[PDB]
Design a protein around this ligand. Structure first.
Ligand SMILES: [Mg+2]
Ligand SMILES: [Zn+2]
Ligand SMILES: [Zn+2]
Ligand SMILES: [Zn+2]
Ligand SMILES: [Zn+2]
Lengths: 57, 268, 62, 107, 1464
RNA sequence: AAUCGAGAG
DNA sequence: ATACGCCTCTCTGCTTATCGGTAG
DNA sequence: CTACCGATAAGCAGATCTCTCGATTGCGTAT
C-alpha cells in the first residue's frame, strides 16, 4: 500500500510517478524518548505495524 | 528512510500505549532521534514535516521544488502561518504526554508528517548461525556461504587482535580446536605425517597404525598386511598428535614439490 | 619580473576561520578550525582545532 | 691510529688485518672536523669491559648474538675502537622514562 | 576438539629436507602408469590416476588399507619419470652452481685453498662463533705452503669450536640467531659471487665452456675460442642432456662434499649424511592422494580435477617417450644414423623438453610457455593461496553473524542474543553431581525449548542426538544421564550434554575490519525473547567503530573452560576501558544520554520524593546486584520547606553512593566540562565539576564525564574502584539517563534554528560588508591600486594571467579565502549565541552542539548563520578556461559568491549557484573517502607480521619469540599504558589517598618485597644526578646508572623511572599539604609497582596496532614533505635511503642575526645559470660556415647579485668553463644523431677569447660585459655539412643543466619562522659534511636531518633510532594523533636491531629463525626453497609457526606451564 | 570453481 | 551426427649488460 | 700491458577487511 506524498515537487506529476508509489506518509516525531534510537536506528509504532504500515511481499 | 537520506534500521516496535501521545490523541508511527540532524544537517526534513502536517490539515498539497523560497519568503514562515491558521503551533510543536508514566513531557514535541520509504535490505537475508555442518573438501574446514550452511571466517586481523589480548587458549579454540582439529597418527621414528597407514587387520590379530616409509619389504609378530595382501615388516614406532588437517594437505602439496617436512615428536 | 603578486609570505597568510572553542593548553579564545569528513559517507565529522597563541593542535571528532 | 688527508689506495687497505695481534685503524682528516658524540642525538656510548659483560649475560641468560647489534663499521664503533664481541653501554635519554641504559654488541 | 581425548605427543620442531626418489618409491603405495582416470562404465581403471591404491574413491574400499571413503586417510602414490628433470624450485641454484664449475678436474674454478677458507668459516658459523670467523682471515704466513696454511686454519677452527663447546658458549646442535643467520647468508652470497667470477680453473687450469640462459627447462653452452683451446692444448648454442648435467654435478659434488656439507647446512649435521646431487632432479614424481585430488561433482558437472589433468598430461608424455624409445631400439640396429635414427633422436629430444616442461607446469604455472591451469606454487603463493587463507585464518564452527540493534537495557558487559541463535549454539557440558540438577532439565526440555540440549555424548564417544526423540525418550535418557559404568575402560570419563547457550555463558564479539584488539571483546550473554538481531549496549560503539545503521557483527562461542576464562578475564569488555594506543578511555555514553545528563544535572531540576525514589530504584534495582548495601539508601532533600525537593545532582550522588562499595570514601574530583559559565547566566560556576566524598556539588555532567574524555568521573571511578565498578557505573548511568529521557523527553525543531529580528539584522549588516572582499583581494593580488573598478581592463589582464598560472591562482584563492573567512567568523561570533531567539539550555541544537552529544559549532553556524566559502583541495571552486567560474558568472568575476563563498544557510536554503558549489564540495568529500577506502592499509599487516612475536618476558626485557632481545625495558620504565594514566595525577592521588590505600593494601604486599635497597640506591642516584646535569651528555659519566637497570621494579619498591621520581619530588616540594608526605610517597611507589606491564604482554602486536589503526584516520591527504601513509611507507615499509623530500635542520647561533642568516641561506642555496639569464638571442647565419652567434642577456647586476649573492666574475668563470663545454657536447651529440653591445677589447678579454677558442671545439668569438656584467656574446661557428639545428632548445636545456654554484645535494636553504622559539634553517638536501664548514653560522652539534639512512651513515645506529622515533612521531603529531612513545620506541628498536636500517617488508625479514612466518607472509616459494636448501630446522617459536603446526601460542597465557600438586 | 554485474557495513 | 585435437596511463626492491676506469 | 673491475645503463619480480545475491562459463576437423 503506497501513497502519494503530501509535499512533492511539481515534476512528480509530470513524470507520472503516482503510477508507481514509492513510500508512505507517516507521522514522525523528532523526539528523544525511547533510548532505542540513538545513532541511526528508529522506532516503529507496533500498532501501525499491525495495521499494515510499511508492508510488502 | 525518508527522502532526505535519513536511513536507519527499525530498532524496536514500540507498543502504542508506550508511545508518547499528543493532545490531539495521535501517536506517531515513526520516532526519529533529534540527534540525527545536527551533524547530517538535513533541514529539509524539518521543513517537509512542517509542510506535510499543514497539508494534511488543510487537505492540500505543497510543492517542494528547490529555489521557490528565498531569503525573504522563508518556508518556515510560510508553512508556519499555514499551521497557525488551523489552530496548531506556528513552529510545528505539539504538547505531547508520556505514555509510559502519564505526565506531560518537559517541552513541546516537534511532530509532522514526512514521506517514508521502505528499503529492501531486510534482516532475514543477513543473519546466519552455524554450530556444526558441511566442511570443505581438502581442508576439513567449514564451507563458505550463508545459504550453504557454512562458517564465517576468522581472518588475519582477527588472529592478530586475538593474539594481542594475550588470549592464547581462545585463539587456539577459534583457529584450531573448532576449525580443523584432527588427531592424526605420526611416525615417532621417521617424523612424517601422512606416510603412515592403518594395517589391514587379520583374523584374530588387531589393526594397528604402521609406517610406510620406515617399513622394509618382507621379500627384501611385527608384520602386517595391506589391502593388496603384500605384507611386510615395519616400525610400529608411531604416535598420535593433534594437528590441523590443512597441515596434512600442505604436506601433500610439499610432496608434490619434492620437499619433505620432518616433524619431531617431543616424547620419543 | 612580473607585475602580479607571485610570492605569499608565511606572515601575510592569515588562515582565517576563527571560532570561540576553548583551548586545552592556555585558554585563549581564538582557536581555528577545519572539518574533514572521514571513514564513511555516513560517519561523523572531525574538526582540526588549532590555537592561535600557543600553537596547540587538536583534531577531535566530538 | 692512522689519519689520511684525501684518499686511500687499495695497496694500503690491504694490510689492515695483516698484522696480528695488534690493530690499525684508519680515519679521514676530512669528515672528522666534528665529533659524532657531541651531537645531541647520539647517546653516551661507554665501552663495556668483559668483567661486567659476563655479568650482564648471566643476569639476562643471553648468548652474545641475541643482543641488539652495533655495526663494526658505524662511526660510534669507529670512534671507540670497538672490537668484535665486546658489548657497549648506551645511556639513552628517553622522552618518557628519562635516562635508561641499553647494551648493544659489536659483531 | 574434545577435552576428554588427551594427546601425549607434540611437534616440538620441524625441519626442511628433500624427498629423494629412492624414499618416494620406498614410501609409495602404487606407481601410476596410464592416464586412464575413468574408463567406460564410469569407474576408475586399475593402476590409473584415481586408483583404488591412492585412497577409497566413491563407494569403493581403498585397495591399500581396506577402509571406507570417509575413514581412509589417503595413501601416497608416484609416477616414474624416465628422464630426470630440472626442478623449477632448485633450478636457480643449480644453474648458478653449474655456471661456476670445471668439467675436467671435477673441482670448482676457484682456488681450492679459498674453498677451504670458506668451508672453515661456514663450519664456524654453524655454531655461535661469528667472531672467530673474522679472526680466521688473520691466518696468513707451493703445495707444502698451502697445506701448512690450510692445516693451521683447520686447527684454529677446530680448537676454537672445542673451546666454545666446552665453556658453554655453544652446544652440539649449534647456535642460530638472527645475527648468525645474517652473517652466514652474507658469507654464502659472497661465496657464490666468488665462485661465479672465474675465467680459468685453478686446480687443473683448463677452461670450461660458458652457458646461456633463456628461461626455464633449457640450458645451453657455447664453444671455446682459439685462445682457450691453445691453453687447454698446452696444458697436457648446443643442447646438454639432463642425465649428462646430473653426472657433471654428481662429480662436482662428490669432489667438493667438504665445503658443500656446510654450504647446504646451518646446523651441525648430527647425521653426517652426504649431500647427494640427485636432490635437484625429480627422478620420481609424487602424486597427491585421490582424497586431495577428488573431482568436483556439481550436479552432473563432474569435471576432472586440475591436478589429475596435469598429471595425466605428464603421463601421456611419459608413455609417448616409453613407446618411442622402443622404436629407437630397433632402428638403432638397422643403423641409419643419418636419415631415420636422427629423426627419432630429434623427436626424443623434443619429447624430453616437453616432459620437463610438463613437470615445470605441474609445479609452477608461472613458467608455462604457450586462464592458465594453477600449479602447486600458485596454490600457496598469495592471499587466495593456502597459508593466508586456510592457516592464517579459517572458517570456524559455533559462530553466528547478524545485524546489531541498540539496547540500553543490557548491562554494558552483555550482548542481547536472539532466541534463534540460543537454540543452535551449544556448549559441551560434562555431567557431575552439581550438574544433574539442570543438565537433566535441559535434556528433558530438548532441542527446541530453551534452555535445553541438542546432543548427548556418551562415555565411549557415542554421539546421541535429541533432535528426533520423543518426550518419553528424553525423560528416560535424562533418567540415565548419570549412571555408573560397568565398562572400566572409560571409568575415568563422564557424559557430556550439548546444552543450549544459557545466560552464564560468554561470547566473543567481533566487527571487521578488526583494526585493534579492542574490536574483539568478550560479552556475557543475556538471552532475549523476541527478535533476530544481536542486541548491543551503546558503550560498545567507540570500541567497534560501529553504528546501528545495518552493521553486522560476528559472534563466536568458545567451547572450552580455558577460552571461557580467557574471554571472561583477559578479553572481556570491562578490561578494555582505555585503549593501549595512548591510554585515553574508549567507552562512554554517546548522545541521548549526554543531553539527558546535561538536563538532569542542571540547577533547574527538582524532584519530589516519589520522582526521586522512582529514578533511583529504576536505575539501581538491587535484585541484580547494582547496590553494594542490600538496601537502597537515599539522601535528605535539598529543600525542606515548603515541600521536599531533591535535585538532579542528588540523583547522581545517590547513584554513586549505591554503586560505590562501602568501607571506602568517595571521589574527590575537580574537573571541567564543555559548557562554559557564560551560558548559564551571571556569576555562575556551572562549568566547574566538583565531587566531595562521593557527592556532586557543582557543575553539569557532560561528555567530559561519561564518554571519551580523560579525567572525568567514570575514568576516576575506574582509577579508584577498579574496572568492574566503572562498568556498573556506566550501566547504571545509562539506565538512569534512559528512564529519565522517557519521563521528560528531549526534542529539536524549527524553532531551535531561528534567530531574532535583530539577530538577522546583524547577520545581514555584516554580510553586506562581503560585497567588496573578493574585489579588494583581487585588486591587491594583482598589485593594483585599491578602489579599482571590477571592470578595469588592467585588472582583467592581470586576472587572466593569474588564471593561466597555477601558482598565481593559488595565491589568489588563498588571499580571497582568508578575507571571506574573516567575514564568516565575524558573522558567527556576532550572531551566536546572541542572535538565537531560543537560547541554551532551551535551544536543543545549540545544547547538543555545546555538550558534544552530537554536532559542532561549525554545524550550528552552518544551519543558522552561514555556509561560508567552499574550498576544493586548498583552492576555491574550479575556473573554466574562459575565466568563468559558472555559466551564471561573467568572466573574471571579482565576487566572493562567484568564487564559492556561500552566504546562504541551511535554514533558509541556498541559491542554485551556491548549491552547485556545495555539491562540488560534497562530491570532493566522497571522492576523498573513496580514495581512503581504496588505498587504506597493509602497513598494519607488514608491521604485525614481524612484531607478532615480540613480548614482555619474566625478566621484564621485551624480546622476539625465538629469544632475541629487542629492549631491556618496555619504554625504559616497564609501566603499562592501560595503567599509566593517573600516575602523574598527584592531586587526584592525594585527594583519594585513603581509597587508593584501601585498594592497594600494603599490609598484604609488604612481606614478599624489599623496601630498603631500591630506595637507598634511588636516593644516591638522585643525589649524584643533582650534583651533575649542568654538564653536556657527552661529558657526564655513569658512576651511577638508572635504578631500573639494577633492581627488578616488580620486586623492589622504589625502583622507578628517572622522570617519574623527579616529577614526584617536584610535586612533594612545590606543594606541602592530614597525611604525611612519607605515606603519600610510599603510596605512589606502590602504585608504580602495580602499574607495571605484565610479562607476556604482546607489546609487538599492541604497538603494530597502535601505529596502524590510528593511521587510517590520516589517509586523507588534503591541506612538499611526505605525510601520512606515504611517509610511514617510506620509514617503516621501505626504509628507503632515497627519501622523497630530504631535509636538514640547521640550528643557528644565537648571535647571528636574521639578516645574516638570510645571507647565509643565499650563499648556501644552489643557483643555476638559468636563474640569472633573462633571455638568449640566437642569430644563425649560414652565409660555408654556419655561424651561430649567441647573445645571452642577463638580469641587471644590482638585481641578481642582491638576489643570489652571485658576482660577475663568478658568473663569467661559470660561462667560460662549464656552460660552453656542455653546450658543445650537446651540439656534437645532436650532429652525430643528425648524420643518420661592443667589442672594444682591452687585450685581457682578448687573451680570454684566445683561451676559450683554443680550449673549445667551435667557439670563434667571445666577449663578456666585464665593466657592467649585463650580457655575454660568443659566436659558435660551424660547417655546412650539418643540417639544421634548433640551437634554442639546446641552449635552454643546457642553461637549465648548468650550475653556477652548488653545495652537493643541496638545492635550497630556506629560513622558516622559529618553531618553539628555536631558530632553524632548513635545507632541501642532506649532506652533513658540507655544513660543518660554516661553524660561524650553524650549530653543528644540533644538525639533525629528515633522512634516516644519512643519519645512520654519519652518526651511527643509535642516532638513526632516535631520528626514526622523531620522524614516526612527527607524522602523528601533525594529525594530532597521540601514540605512546613506548610503541614508537619498540618499533624503532626492532627496525634497527641489526645495526642497520631494516624495514617491515619481505626484504627486511630475510634474517629470521622461523621460516613459517615469512612463508605465510609472502613469496612463499622463494622463502621455502631458501629454507630447504639450508636445511633450516625451525623450533616453532614465532606465533605463525605455532598456528601452522597447531600448537598453543607463546605470548600471553602461553608464557608459562601449569603443573599439578598431587598430595600422595 | 573463475569472471562479470549489483550492492551492505 | 559426433569424437580428435588447441587459442591505452604505478612502485619498491634484486639482478644483469656494456663499453669503458684502475691499480700494479 | 694487463687483467680486473665497475659505474653506469638495462632487465625483472611482487602486493596493492568482512559479507550477501545473480548470470555465465568456447570452438575447428574429420568418419
Ligand atoms: Mg554502520
Ligand atoms: Zn616412519
Ligand atoms: Zn592555546
Ligand atoms: Zn586407504
Ligand atoms: Zn679444473
Amino acid at each position: 500500500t503506497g501513497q502519494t506524498p503530501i509535499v512533492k515537487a511539481n515534476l512528480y506529476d509530470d513524470y507520472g510517478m503516482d503510477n508507481f508509489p514509492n513510500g508512505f506518509n507517516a507521522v514522525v516525531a523528532v523526539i528523544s524518548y525511547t533510548g532505542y534510537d540513538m545513532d541511526d536506528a528508529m522506532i516503529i509504532n507496533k500498532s501501525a505495524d499491525e495495521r499494515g504500515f510499511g508492508y510488502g511481499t | 528512510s525518508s527522502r532526505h537520506g535519513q536511513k536507519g534500521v527499525c530498532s524496536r516496535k514500540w507498543p502504542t500505549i508506550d508511545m508518547p501521545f499528543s493532545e490531539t490523541g495521535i501517536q506517531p508511527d515513526i520516532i526519529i532521534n533529534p540527534h540525527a540532524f545536527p551533524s547530517r544537517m538535513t533541514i529539509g526534513m524539518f521543513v517537509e514535516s512542517l509542510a506535510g502536517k499543514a497539508g494534511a490539515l488543510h487537505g492540500i498539497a505543497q510543492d517542494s521544488t528547490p529555489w521557490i523560497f528565498n531569503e525573504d519568503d522563508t518556508p518556515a514562515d510560510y508553512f508556519g502561518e499555514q499551521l497557525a491558521k488551523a489552530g496548531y503551533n506556528y513552529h510545528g510543536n505539539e504538547p505531547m504526554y508520556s505514555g509510559a508514566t502519564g505526565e506531560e513531557l518537559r517541552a513541546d514535541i516537534y511532530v509532522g508528517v514526512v514521506y517514508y520509504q521502505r528499503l529492501r535490505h531486510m534482516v532475514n537475508d543477513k543473519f546466519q548461525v552455524r554450530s556444526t555442518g558441511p566442511v570443505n573438501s581438502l581442508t576439513m574446514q567449514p564451507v563458505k556461504g550463508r545459504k550453504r550452511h557454512g562458517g564465517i571466517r576468522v581472518g588475519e586481523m582477527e588472529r592478530d587482535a586475538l593474539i594481542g589480548h594475550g588470549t592464547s587458549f581462545l585463539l587456539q579454540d577459534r583457529l584450531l580446536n573448532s576449525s580443523d582439529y584432527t588427531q592424526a597418527s605420526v611416525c615417532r621414528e621417521c617424523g612424517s605425517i601422512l606416510t603412515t597407514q592403518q594395517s589391514v587387520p587379520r583374523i584374530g590379530s588387531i589393526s594397528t597404525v604402521c609406517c610406510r616409509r620406515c617399513s622394509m619389504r618382507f621379500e627384501d609378530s611385527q608384520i602386517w598386511e595391506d589391502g593388496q595382501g603384500n605384507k611386510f615388516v615395519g616400525g610400529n614406532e608411531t604416535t598420535t598428535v593433534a594437528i590441523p588437517f590443512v597441515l596434512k594437505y600442505l604436506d601433500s602439496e610439499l610432496s608434490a614439490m619434492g620437499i619433505r617436512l620432518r616433524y619431531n615428536v617431543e616424547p620419543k | 619580473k612580473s607585475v602580479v603578486k607571485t610570492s605569499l609570505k608565511k606572515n601575510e597568510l592569515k588562515d582565517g576561520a576563527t571560532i570561540k572553542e576553548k583551548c586545552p593548553q592556555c585558554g585563549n579564545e581564538e582557536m581555528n578550525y577545519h572539518t574533514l569528513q572521514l571513514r564513511s559517507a555516513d560517519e561523523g565529522a572531525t574538526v582540526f582545532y588549532t590555537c592561535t597563541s600557543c600553537g596547540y593542535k587538536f583534531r577531535t571528532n566530538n | 691510529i692512522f689519519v689520511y688527508q684525501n684518499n686511500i689506495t687499495p695497496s694500503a687497505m690491504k694490510l689492515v688485518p695483516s698484522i696480528p695481534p695488534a690493530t690499525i685503524e684508519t680515519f679521514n682528516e676530512a669528515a672528522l672536523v666534528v665529533n659524532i658524540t657531541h651531537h645531541e642525538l647520539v647517546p653516551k656510548h661507554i665501552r663495556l669491559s668483559s668483567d661486567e659483560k659476563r655479568e650482564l649475560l648471566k643476569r639476562y641468560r643471553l648468548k652474545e648474538s641475541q643482543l641488539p647489534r652495533i655495526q663494526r663499521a658505524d662511526p660510534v664503533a669507529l670512534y671507540l675502537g670497538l672490537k668484535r664481541g665486546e658489548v657497549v653501554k648506551i645511556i639513552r635519554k628517553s622522552e618518557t622514562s628519562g635516562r635508561y641504559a641499553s647494551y648493544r654488541i659489536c659483531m | 576438539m574434545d577435552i576428554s581425548k588427551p594427546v601425549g605427543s607434540e611437534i616440538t620442531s620441524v625441519d626442511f629436507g628433500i624427498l629423494t626418489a629412492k624414499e618416494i618409491r620406498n614410501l609409495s603405495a602404487k606407481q601410476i602408469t596410464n592416464p586412464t582416470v575413468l574408463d567406460n562404465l564410469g569407474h576408475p581403471v586399475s593402476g590409473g590416476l584415481y586408483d583404488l591404491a591412492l585412497g577409497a574413491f566413491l563407494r569403493n574400499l581403498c585397495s591399500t588399507c581396506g577402509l571406507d571413503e570417509k575413514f581412509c586417510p589417503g595413501h601416497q602414490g608416484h609416477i616414474e619419470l624416465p628422464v630426470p628433470c630440472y626442478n623449477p624450485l632448485f633450478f636457480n641454484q643449480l644453474y648458478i652452481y653449474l655456471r661456476a664449475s670445471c668439467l675436467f678436474c671435477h673441482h670448482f674454478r676457484l682456488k681450492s685453498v679459498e674453498v677451504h677458507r670458506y668451508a672453515c668459516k661456514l663450519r664456524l658459523l654453524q655454531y655461535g662463533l661469528i667472531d672467530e670467523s673474522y679472526k680466521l682471515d688473520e691466518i696468513t704466513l707451493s703445495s707444502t705452503l698451502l697445506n701448512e696454511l690450510k692445516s693451521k686454519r683447520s686447527e684454529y677452527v677446530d680448537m676454537a669450536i672445542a673451546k666454545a663447546l666446552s665453556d658453554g658458549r655453544t652446544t652440539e646442535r649449534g647456535s642460530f640467531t638472527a645475527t648468525v643467520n645474517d652473517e652466514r647468508k652474507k658469507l654464502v652470497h659472497e661465496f657464490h659471487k666468488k665462485l661465479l667470477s672465474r675465467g680459468k680453473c685453478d686446480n687443473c687450469g683448463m677452461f670450461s665452456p660458458k652457458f646461456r640462459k633463456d628461461g626455464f627447462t633449457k640450458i645451453f653452452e657455447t664453444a671455446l675460442n682459439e685462445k682457450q683451446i691453445t691453453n687447454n692444448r698446452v696444458k697436457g648454442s648446443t643442447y646438454i642432456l639432463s642425465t649428462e648435467v646430473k653426472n657433471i654435478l654428481d662429480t662436482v659434488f662428490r669432489k667438493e662434499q667438504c665445503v658443500l656439507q656446510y654450504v647446504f647446512h646451518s646446523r651441525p649435521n648430527l647425521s653426517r649424511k652426504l649431500v647427494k646431487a640427485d636432490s635437484f632432479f625429480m627422478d620420481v614424481l609424487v602424486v597427491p592422494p585421490t582424497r586431495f585430488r577428488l573431482p568436483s561433482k556439481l550436479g552432473e558437472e563432474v569435471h576432472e580435477n586440475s591436478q589429475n589433468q596435469l598429471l595425466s598430461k605428464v603421463l601421456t608424455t611419459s608413455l609417448l617417450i616409453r613407446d618411442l624409445n622402443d622404436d629407437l631400439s630397433k632402428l638403432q640396429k638397422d643403423k641409419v644414423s643419418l636419415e631415420d635414427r636422427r629423426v627419432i633422436f630429434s623427436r626424443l629430444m623434443n619429447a624430453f623438453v616437453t616432459i620437463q616442461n610438463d613437470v615445470n607446469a605441474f609445479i609452477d604455472s608461472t613458467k608455462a610457455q604457450g586462464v592458465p591451469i594453477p600449479g602447486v606454487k600458485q596454490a600457496l603463493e598469495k592471499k587466495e593461496g593456502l597459508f593466508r587463507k586456510h592457516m592464517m585464518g579459517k572458517r570456524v564452527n559455533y559462530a553466528a553473524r547478524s545485524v546489531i540493534s541498540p539496547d540500553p537495557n543490557i548491562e554494558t558487559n552483555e550482548i542481547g542474543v536472539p532466541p534463534v541463535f540460543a537454540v543452535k549454539l551449544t556448549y559441551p557440558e560434562p555431567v557431575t553431581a552439581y550438574n544433574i540438577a539442570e543438565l537433566r532439565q535441559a535434556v528433558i526440555n530438548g532441542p527446541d525449548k530453551w534452555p535445553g540440549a541438542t546432543q548427548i555424548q556418551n562415555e565411549d564417544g557415542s554421539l546421541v542426538s535429541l533432535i528426533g526423540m520423543s518426550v518419553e525418550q528424553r525423560k528416560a535418557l535424562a533418567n540415565q544421564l548419570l549412571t555408573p559404568s560397568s565398562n572400566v575402560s572409560t571409568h575415568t570419563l563422564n557424559k557430556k550434554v550439548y546444552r543450549h547457550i544459557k545466560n552464564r555463558d560468554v561470547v566473543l564479539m567481533n566487527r571487521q575490519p578488526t583494526l585493534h584488539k579492542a574490536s574483539m571483546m568478550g560479552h556475557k550473554v543475556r538471552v532475549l525473547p523476541n527478535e533476530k538481531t544481536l542486541r548491543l549496549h551503546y558503550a560498545n560503539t567507540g570500541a567497534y567503530n560501529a553504528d546501528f545503521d545495518g552493521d553486522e557483527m560476528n559472534m563466536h562461542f568458545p567451547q572450552n573452560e580455558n577460552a571461557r576464562a580467557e574471554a571472561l578475564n583477559l578479553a572481556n569488555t570491562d578490561s578494555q576501558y582505555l585503549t593501549p594506543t595512548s591510554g585515553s578511555p574508549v567507552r562512554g555514553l554517546i548522545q541521548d544520554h549526554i543531553s539527558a545528563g546535561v538536563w538532569l544535572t542542571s540547577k533547574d531540576s527538582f524532584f519530589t520524593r516519589e520522582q526521586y525514589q522512582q529514578y533511583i530504584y529504576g536505575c539501581i534495582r538491587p535484585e541484580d546486584g547494582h547496590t553494594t548495601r542490600s538496601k537502597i539508601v537515599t539522601l535528605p532533600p535539598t529543600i525542606f520547606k515548603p515541600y521536599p525537593l531533591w535535585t538532579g545532582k542528588q540523583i547522581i550522588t545517590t547513584v554513586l553512593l549505591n554503586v560505590t562499595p562501602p568501607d571506602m570514601p568517595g571521589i574527590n574530583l575537580i574537573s571541567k566540562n564543555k559548557i562554559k559559565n557564560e551560558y548559564w547566566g551571571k556569576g555562575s560556576l556551572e562549568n566547574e565539576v566538583l565531587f566531595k566524598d562521593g557527592a556532586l556539588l557543582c557543575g553539569i555532567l557532560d561528555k567530559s564525564q561519561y564518554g571519551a574524555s580523560k579525567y572525568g568521573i567514570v575514568h576516576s571511578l575506574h582509577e579508584v574502584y577498579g574496572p568492574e565498578v566503572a562498568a556498573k557505573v556506566l550501566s547504571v548511568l545509562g539506565r538512569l539517563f534512559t528512564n529519565y529521557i522517557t519521563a521528560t523527553a528531549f526534542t529539536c525543531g524549527m524553532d531551535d534554528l531561528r534567530l531574532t529580528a535583530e539577530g538577522n539584522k546583524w547577520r545581514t549588516d555584516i554580510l553586506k560588508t562581503s560585497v567588496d572582499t573578493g574585489r579588494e583581494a583581487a585588486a591587491e593580488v594583482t598589485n593594483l591600486d585599491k578602489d579599482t573598478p571590477a571592470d578595469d581592463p588592467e585588472l582583467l589582464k592581470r586576472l587572466q594571467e593569474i588564471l593561466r598560472d597555477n601558482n598565481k591562482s593559488g595565491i589568489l584563492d588563498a588571499v580571497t579565502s582568508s578575507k571571506v573567512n574573516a567575514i564568516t567568523s565575524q558573522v558567527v561570533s556576532k550572531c551566536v549565541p546572541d542572535g538565537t531567539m531560543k537560547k541554551f539550555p532551551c535551544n536543543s541544537m545549540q545544547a547538543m552542539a555545546l555538550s558534544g552529544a552530537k554536532g559542532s559549532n561549525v554545524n550550528v553556524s552552518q544551519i543558522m548563520c552561514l555556509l561560508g566559502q567552499q574550498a576544493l583541495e586548498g583552492r576555491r571552486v574550479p575556473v573554466m578556461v574562459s575565466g568563468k567560474t559558472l555559466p551564471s558568472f561573467k568572466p573574471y568575476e571579482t565576487d566572493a559568491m562567484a568564487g564559492g563563498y556561500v552566504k546562504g544557510r541551511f535554514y533558509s536554503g541556498i541559491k542554485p549557484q551556491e548549491y552547485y558549489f556545495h555539491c562540488m564540495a560534497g562530491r570532493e568529500g566522497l571522492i576523498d573517502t573513496a580514495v581512503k577506502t581504496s588505498r587504506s592499509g597493509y602497513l598494519q599487516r607488514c608491521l604485525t607480521k614481524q612484531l607478532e612475536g615480540v613480548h614482555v618476558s619474566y625478566d621484564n626485557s621485551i624480546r622476539d619469540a625465538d629469544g632475541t632481545l629487542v629492549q631491556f625495558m618496555y619504554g625504559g620504565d616497564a609501566i603499562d599504558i592501560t595503567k599509566e594514566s593517573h600516575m602523574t595525577q598527584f592531586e587526584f592521588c592525594l585527594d583519594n589517598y585513603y581509597a587508593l590505600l584501601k585498594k592497594y593494601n600494603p599490609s598484604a604486599l609488604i612481606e614478599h618485597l624489599d623496601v630498603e635497597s631500591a630506595l637507598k640506591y634511588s636516593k644516591k642516584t638522585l643525589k649524584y644526578r643533582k650534583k651533575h646535569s649542568k654538564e653536556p651528555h657527552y661529558k657526564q659519566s655513569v658512576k651511577y646508572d638508572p635504578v631500573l637497570a639494577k633492581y627488578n621494579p616488580a620486586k623492589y619498591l622504589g625502583s622507578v623511572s628517572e622522570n617519574f621520581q623527579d616529577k614526584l619530588e617536584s610535586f612533594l616540594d612545590k606543594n606541602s599539604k592530614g597525611v604525611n608526605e612519607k605515606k603519600f610517597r610510599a603510596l605512589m611507589q606502590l602504585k608504580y609497582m602495580r602499574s607495571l606491564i605484565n610479562p607476556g604482554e604482546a607489546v609487538g602486536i599492541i604497538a603494530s596496532q597502535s601505529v596502524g589503526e590510528p593511521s587510517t584516520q590520516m589517509t586523507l591527504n588534503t591541506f612538499n614533505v611526505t605525510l601520512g601513509i606515504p611517509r610511514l611507507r617510506e620509514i617503516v615499509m621501505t626504509a628507503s635511503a632515497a627519501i622523497k623530500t630530504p631535509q636538514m635542520t640547521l640550528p643557528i647561533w644565537n648571535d647571528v642575526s636574521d639578516e645574516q642568516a638570510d645571507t647565509f641561506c643565499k650563499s648556501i642555496s644552489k643557483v643555476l645559470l638559468s636563474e640569472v639569464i633573462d633571455k638568449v638571442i640566437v642569430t644563425e647565419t649560414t652565409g660555408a660556415a654556419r655561424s651561430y652567434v649567441i647573445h645571452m642577456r642577463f638580469f641587471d647586476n644590482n638585481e641578481y647579485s642582491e638576489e643570489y649573492d652571485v658576482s660577475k666574475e663568478e658568473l663569467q668563470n661559470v660561462i667560460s668553463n662549464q656552460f660552453i663545454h656542455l653546450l658543445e657536447a650537446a651540439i656534437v651529440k645532436e650532429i652525430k644523431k643528425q648524420k643518420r653591445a661592443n667589442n672594444n677589447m682591452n687585450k685581457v678579454q682578448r687573451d680570454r677569447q684566445s683561451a676559450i677558442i683554443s680550449h673549445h671545439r667551435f667557439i670563434t668569438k667571445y666577449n663578456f660585459d666585464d665593466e657592467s656584467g649585463k650580457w655575454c656574446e660568443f659566436k659558435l661557428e660551424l660547417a655546412a655539412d650539418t643540417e639544421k639545428l634548433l640551437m634554442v632548445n639546446i641552449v635552454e636545456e643546457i642553461c637549465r643543466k648548468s650550475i653556477i654554484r652548488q653545495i652537493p645535494h643541496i638545492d635550497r636553504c630556506v629560513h622558516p619562522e622559529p618553531e618553539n622559539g628555536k631558530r632553524v634553517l632548513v635545507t632541501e638536501g642532506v649532506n652533513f659534511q658540507a655544513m660543518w664548514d660554516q661553524e660561524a653560522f650553524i650549530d653543528v652539534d644540533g644538525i639533525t636531518s629528515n633522512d634516516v639512512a644519512a643519519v645512520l651513515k654519519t652518526y651511527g645506529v643509535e642516532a638513526a633510532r632516535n631520528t626514526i622515533v622523531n620522524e614516526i612521531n612527527n607524522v602523528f603529531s601533525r594529525y594530532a594523533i597521540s601514540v605512546s612513545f613506548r610503541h614508537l620506541d619498540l618499533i624503532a628498536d626492532m627496525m634497527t636491531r641489526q645495526g642497520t636500517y631494516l624495514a617491515f617488508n619481505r626484504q627486511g625479514m630475510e634474517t629470521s629463525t622461523s621460516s613459517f612466518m615469512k612463508m605465510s607472509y609472502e613469496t612463499t616459494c622463494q622463502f621455502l626453497t631458501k629454507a630447504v636448501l639450508d636445511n633450516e630446522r625451525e623450533q616453532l617459536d614465532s606465533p605463525s609457526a605455532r598456528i601452522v603446526v597447531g600448537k598453543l601460542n607463546n605470548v600471553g597465557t602461553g608464557s608459562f606451564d601449569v603443573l599439578a600438586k598431587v598430595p600422595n
